[PDB]
Amino acid sequence: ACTKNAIAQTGFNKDKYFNGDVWYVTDYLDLEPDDVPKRYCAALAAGTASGKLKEALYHYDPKTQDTFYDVSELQVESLGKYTANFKKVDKNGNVKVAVTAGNYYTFTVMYADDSSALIHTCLHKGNKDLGDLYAVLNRNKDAAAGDKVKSAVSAATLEFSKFISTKENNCAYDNDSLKSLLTK
Numbered sequence: 001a002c003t004k005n006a007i008a009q010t011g012f013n014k015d016k017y018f019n020g021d022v023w024y025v026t027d028y029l030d031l032e033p034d035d036v037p038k039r040y041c042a043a044l045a046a047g048t049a050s051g052k053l054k055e056a057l058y059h060y061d062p063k064t065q066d067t068f069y070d071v072s073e074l075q076v077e078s079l080g081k082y083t084a085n086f087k088k089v090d091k092n093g094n095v096k097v098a099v100t101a102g103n104y105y106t107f108t109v110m111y112a113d114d115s116s117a118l119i120h121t122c123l124h125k126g127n128k129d130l131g132d133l134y135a136v137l138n139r140n141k142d143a144a145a146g147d148k149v150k151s152a153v154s155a156a157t158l159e160f161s162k163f164i165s166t167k168e169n170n171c172a173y174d175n176d177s178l179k180s181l182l183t184k
Helices: 147-154 176-183
Strands: 022-030 041-049 052-060 065-080 081-089 095-097 103-112 118-127 128-138
Touching: 022 118, 022 176, 041 176, 052 081, 052 176, 065 095, 065 103, 065 176, 103 147
Parallel strands: none
Antiparallel strands: 022 041, 022 128, 041 052, 052 065, 065 081, 081 095, 081 103, 103 118, 118 128
């Protein structure tokens, strides 16, 4: 179940966020902690491609090796709040599961700057969801969270100390696949 209406950053800069580069999840927190494994890897590319707002999302259980790529044209609810009906694809963009109305996440950017971000998502796969999931992002795979994003976690009335780190999972990312998936 999702329970939060996350507030987007006032003055969110969409061109900077959706610039075609990769964001790495460095830390995450699910309000239903059993919905996501304690050890998990994720990254996303966010861009505009041929005038469509796009995201390509990767996730990987580092212990089971299960690997997933999703691709979505986003639809806009408000500046910094999006609905992403996704298709499951291989790393090359080949469709494995077509878009279908019930398979979507919402995506809210609570804080962003040039190097870091805090997002909330609510995933739906049919009648089931993955809970409220918050993620700290960085442009650099190994970056410890800085004061700006940690303060944004506090501003959301969350405790960064409770976030789970992804840094000890031996995560590796196909950056090239993520970027090229934006076009698919």
